Amino acid sequence: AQSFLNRVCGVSAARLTPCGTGTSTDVVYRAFDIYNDKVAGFAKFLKTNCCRFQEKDEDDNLIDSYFVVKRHTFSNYQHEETIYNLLKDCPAVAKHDFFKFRIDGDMVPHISRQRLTKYTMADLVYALRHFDEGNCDTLKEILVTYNCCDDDYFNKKDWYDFVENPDILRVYANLGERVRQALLKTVQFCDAMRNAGIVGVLTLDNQDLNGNWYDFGDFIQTTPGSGVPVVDSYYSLLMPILTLTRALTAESHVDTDLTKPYIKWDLLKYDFTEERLKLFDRYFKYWDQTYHPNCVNCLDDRCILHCANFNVLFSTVFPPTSFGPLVRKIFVDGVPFVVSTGYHFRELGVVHNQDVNLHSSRLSFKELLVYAADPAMHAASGNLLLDKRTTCFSVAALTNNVAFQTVKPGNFNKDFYDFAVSKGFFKEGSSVELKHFFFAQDGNAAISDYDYYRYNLPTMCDIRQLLFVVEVVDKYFDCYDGGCINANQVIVNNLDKSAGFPFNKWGKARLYYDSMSYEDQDALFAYTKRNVIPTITQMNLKYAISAKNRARTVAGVSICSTMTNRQFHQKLLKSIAATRGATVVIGTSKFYGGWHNMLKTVYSDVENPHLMGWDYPKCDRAMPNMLRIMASLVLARKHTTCCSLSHRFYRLANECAQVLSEM
């Protein structure tokens, strides 16, 4: 009986207590990564064959380290034996122990792992990637165990929400160090595994939350120094947690040492290429696909996504002032200027303009436009500004005093109200009533609504499943036709709207759409097919009826952006807005039976139909950059013949620098 515990305690003197009953196995619910030949997936199964012994501390209090003992086939025993003998050196491996025991008439095999943890990485990843606040208990246990927060916190209702209670970000961030240690130890193991000539697939559910591996179930043999570890599913599933928990935040310190200060990067440095390559080697060594830090050198769009993902990850280390337009000092007719010649994207690395010329004589309309629209001059000729009303990165103030915009209240139509109460409406307690008014706003209304961008955080996407769903989404989109069009085929409804800033100082869009011949417009297109033009966006306050008293804003993009995005996208857009019976139902009027046809089409013939509809909270402010880039690529996919490859990348860069992360 207790001889079992005495044997299992081996020589490491533990005050070790039994947690399955006497000598029988235990039943638990764990998450696994399964791919035999018949079943496959990543889900919660029911592990059953393990006698688990909770190791005890001094003072007879409990401590989180356990011994796990398994029983299986003798052949399995010798296999694990020899392989552990091969790999018994690198600190990434948990100290096994092989022995045999008899219950009754049975010298039965037994494998003991020493000083593990209660959960594996797969459990953490599953908890965070399949969250439901009704039974998030395992997550609670992990957080309280590793001293992130303490129990009394979880009664603070809405603790898990993101928009509500933003401290959850810090609480999650407290796991970064441990997640990092896991990666470092995985690299060490991959090293030892290649050296000792072993082949085998690495998975998540074979690693305690200290990084120590175990469970060589189906590794094989080869000549030493020629073993290939497989790390696809591992990293691909682990990815999102890296940015959710802010793993690499240690890298920014003086020497990856959380106690020391921050590195002082100099203000002028902006290249940052070899640093990215060195981080990629330090943390992802055995990833089996090329990685270009500057997406200019990518091959097709899929490589663009693949590399932009890693760029999203690594760019959360370097200083934030080193992003945005790269300006340089150029001369025209003996006069020095300051114009932008490139960008530095958080995702696409560094991009340099191709057509730049110092020492010019005169500028014609096209260049006058592209120079007046740059933020370079506007920012270089303005006062520094430190706005504490927000947390977003400020830049410069243009004029000496900040303007405060207010929103007036609506107007009352007394005659109609008297009519409606005369005919017996608006009764007390009734159902129909007044709920939609013209809510007024006070002074610092604009900035208090622009501040809502703080819900946008860097997000790292599961690259493989994304690379699959992008194909399926594209397939949802194969009934239309797109491609460039000349200037003399665009269709502008209402040529009498605002032209953004600074062009709104000299008239509406009619002027610029009426003062540039077709040659200038086609030349502007051809120019942006080889350069980058950052622009300024203006924020305007709406004034309309509603039922919630938050202000609402809409962004007004300069004419330089629309005048070209139109020629790039209008053909496909109008082709979408003229198709019936598709999935996207833009352009289908609801009158003259349209509603009926739409309902009939969507209820085509599903076997046992139910309906369902959902809702995204903060849709336009919380969408992460990667999915926006993916959407732009899916839209540009219709351009296989009109444009050439560098042209498509430069169009992507322009659209990003103009509508994704601009001033």
Binding site: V199, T222, T223, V230
Partner: protein, 113 residues
């Protein structure tokens, strides 16, 4: 838990050589994933020292594939005639998964020292 090779593949002899024309005929040993789109080969096994090109006709036998090769792999299988040196040729540009699969098949099929 997670297994790595439910199915393996079969073996062919074919042509290979040091240059596109030095590909003479029947001296190559190819491992081939006969996929959906034709017989796709992965690794080449020979005793010839090094060969930069293999030459196998297409799935429709029109053109003979010009496939540059890895630096051969060194190992010493054994037979009744004692030790026997062989060289394993990977098609350059192969992911770790296909390397692992070919190695599993070969090592489980053929005895080494």
């Amino acid at each position: 838990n997670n297994e790595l090779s439910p199915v393996a593949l079969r073996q062919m002899s074919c042509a290979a050589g040091t240059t596109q024309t030095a590909c003479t005929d029947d001296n190559a040993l190819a491992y081939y994933n006969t996929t959906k789109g034709g017989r796709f080969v992965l690794a080449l096994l020979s005793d010839l020292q090094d060969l930069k090109w293999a030459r196998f006709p297409k799935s429709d036998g029109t053109g003979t594939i010009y496939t540059e090769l890895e630096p051969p792999c060194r190992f010493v299988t054994d037979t009744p005639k004692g030790p026997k040196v062989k060289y394993l040729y990977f098609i350059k540009g192969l992911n770790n998964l296909n390397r692992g699969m070919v190695l599993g098949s070969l090592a489980a099929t053929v005895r080494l020292q």
